[PDB]
Design a protein around this ligand. Structure first.
Ligand code: NI8
Ligand code: CL
Ligand code: CL
Ligand code: CL
Lengths: 99, 99
């Protein structure tokens, strides 16, 4: 699709068998999802936000759909204002900025 | 242009007679620039996200050139670690997400 930016680019994702709302965020290196259960081992990850740094949990090779597009990749879990689809997964699904 | 997301989408902007590097950030409602002089009245604002909040000054009707495309809108100025072009100006240059 082509998504304009007059409103927040909120889409439906599917992760852990559940539908959630998430923001397509080109300003985020990484994908960050609100607290939920994910399988496997996790590792620590520091992310740098506009207001400071925060530690979150990194899970790898997680199945996730974005706008119905299937992906598998790294998902961070922590206290994000909204679910964030960052560049790691945007690149995977072939998302670009255009003007 | 078409900008892939393998790397941070940084572009050159011209604002207040200065050149700066800024991040095209579809996750940001607003545009926030590091400390610099701008003309006109301003109002204080708090903006925030995953890492916390910062205090900024809100300047309205500021002209910016983004990748050679001219736009006008509100610009927030404050201690941001990265200059951010948000949706309020991304729309004005015709920037969309595509996949
Ligand atoms: O921390 C923020 C942040 O504060 N905002 C909100 C924001 C930022 C600028 C201006 C305004 C005002 O509208 C709001 C978010 C928005 N996108 C990523 C902006 N980030 C950066 C971020 C987020 C998650 C992961 C990563 C990894 O790289 C980076
Ligand atoms: Cl990934
Ligand atoms: Cl504006
Ligand atoms: Cl449009």
């Amino acid at each position: 699709p082509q998504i304009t930016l007059w409103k927040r680019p909120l889409v439906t994702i599917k992760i852990g068998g559940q539908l959630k709302e998430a923001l397509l965020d080109t300003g985020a290196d990484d994908t960050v999802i609100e607290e939920m259960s994910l399988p496997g081992r996790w590792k620590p990850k520091m992310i740098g936000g506009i207001g400071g740094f925060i530690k979150v949990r990194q899970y790898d090779q997680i199945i996730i759909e974005i706008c119905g597009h299937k992906a598998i990749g790294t998902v961070l879990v922590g206290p994000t204002p909204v679910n964030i689809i960052g560049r790691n997964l945007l690149t995977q699904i072939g998302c670009t900025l255009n003007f």
